[PDB]
């Protein structure tokens, strides 16, 4: 087919691989930041459930 086919295919491959490398580095940074200070979706460690707390009036008023 000629040299331009291989040339532009190589350009497309290089663009894909460079984008993948940048995405992997960004993913590493995102994971590190979330694990250090969990405020995104990931690394959300559990917490006791709020809905299982009694709020009805009880025997002792000092609650």
């Amino acid at each position: 087919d000629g040299p331009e086919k291989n040339y532009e295919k190589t350009l497309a491959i290089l663009q894909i691989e460079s984008e993948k490398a940048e995405l992997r580095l960004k993913e590493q940074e995102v994971r590190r930041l979330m694990r250090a200070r969990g405020d995104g979706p990931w690394y959300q460690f559990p917490t006791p459930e709020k809905e299982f707390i009694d709020h009805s009036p009880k025997a002792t008023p000092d609650n």
Partner: protein, 170 residues
């Protein structure tokens, strides 16, 4: 002849006229006449037949030319697209420079064989051209290594220019 004297220079031949003092016949002249009449005539006949067949079936081919992509000096680091384009252009120019050196060396060898006993005097300009192009080739391409590249060539040129500028300070 597909070649041209602009890139393959050749001085015009100066052959002397024969001055046979002896009365003996020249066996070289006899053999060259017989050789022409026996060998050269049928060979040029079949070559003319081949040439007229090619003229009947004539085709053409062209020499590919590449436009100048932007140099690696204006390519941002980590931008592998323009870096790839500049690297391919640099490899192309490297191959062209290899063939330029081959042309100069072949020209020098032709000068030496043509002059023979006078090559130490009559090939002064050919040797000067060979020396200058060798010095330029060493300044641009030497000591790059097996993984030679546009980046390495640029780093070598920057180092050489820095040394020259520092020497030009004093």
């Amino acid at each position: 002849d597909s070649w041209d004297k602009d890139v393959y220079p050749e001085p015009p031949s100066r052959t002397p006229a024969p001055s046979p003092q002896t009365s003996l016949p020249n066996p070289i002249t006899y053999l060259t006449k017989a050789y022409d009449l026996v060998v050269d005539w049928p060979v040029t006949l079949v070559r003319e037949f081949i040439e007229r067949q090619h003229a009947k079936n004539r085709t053409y081919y062209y020499h590919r030319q590449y436009r100048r992509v932007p140099d690696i000096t204006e390519c941002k680091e980590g931008d592998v697209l323009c870096i790839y384009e500049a690297e391919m252009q640099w490899r192309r120019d490297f191959k062209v420079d290899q063939e330029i050196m081959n042309i100069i060396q072949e020209r020098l060898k032709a000068c030496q064989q043509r002059e023979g006993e006078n090559y130490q005097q009559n090939c002064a300009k050919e040797l000067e051209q060979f020396t200058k192009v060798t010095k330029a080739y060493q300044d641009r391409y030497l000591d790059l290594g097996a993984y030679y590249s546009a980046r390495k060539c640029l780093a070598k040129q920057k180092q050489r220019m820095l040394e020259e500028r520092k020497a030009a300070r004093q």
